[PDB]
Design a protein around this ligand. Sequence first.
Ligand SMILES: Nc1noc2cccc(C(=O)Nc3ccc4c(c3)CNC4)c12
Lengths: 39, 156
Amino acid sequence: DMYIERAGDITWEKDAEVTGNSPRLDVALDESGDFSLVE
Amino acid sequence: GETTDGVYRVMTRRLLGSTQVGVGVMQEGVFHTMWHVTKGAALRSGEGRLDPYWGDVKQDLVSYCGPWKLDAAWDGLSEVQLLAVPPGERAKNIQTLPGIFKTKDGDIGAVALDYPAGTSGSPILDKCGRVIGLYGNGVVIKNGSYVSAITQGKRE
Ligand SMILES: Nc1noc2cccc(C(=O)Nc3ccc4c(c3)CNC4)c12
């Protein structure tokens, strides 16, 4: 049995830690909802 | 039980101790999460019960108590915030500029932030705090890191 616990409010935070890149990937989505890379 | 708007952890006592299998959004009395987190199973909120209402394996989405309510979209230009809720760790906003997943049926936004699988269902927000999608379904690139799509449902 699964259960839920509150973790916080949904708000934008000014001056949050800015990280991560913006890559452009050629992907494929299958019937099971799984993405895969097409190269 | 608790139906206040907000981000929530999805836990299970089935494995060893209490394990966080994912995360979700409560909005307008509906709980929104990724299909692979619950597999469509019922959920508990204190003494109350949440029953699945809509779901789809291909989209990897599921809603509880009512239809999918989230319909904000990434504008394709601005930076977004992943409100990451990792297992055993505090909720934390991470700002990033999304990349692009190019598919045969159109392009989808994608956030390149590496988090544990139990972080699946964490909301991605626009500058207004509106949920533009959920983190947890993407791909593993060459080094082993995860790049997730900004997965959004459809408000009927
Ligand atoms: N493999 C991962 N490495 O880092 C992650 C971070 C978040 C999620 C995952 C993950 O596994 N997602 C997922 C699991 C099952 C399914 C789907 C997606 C969609 N179809 C069924 C991962």
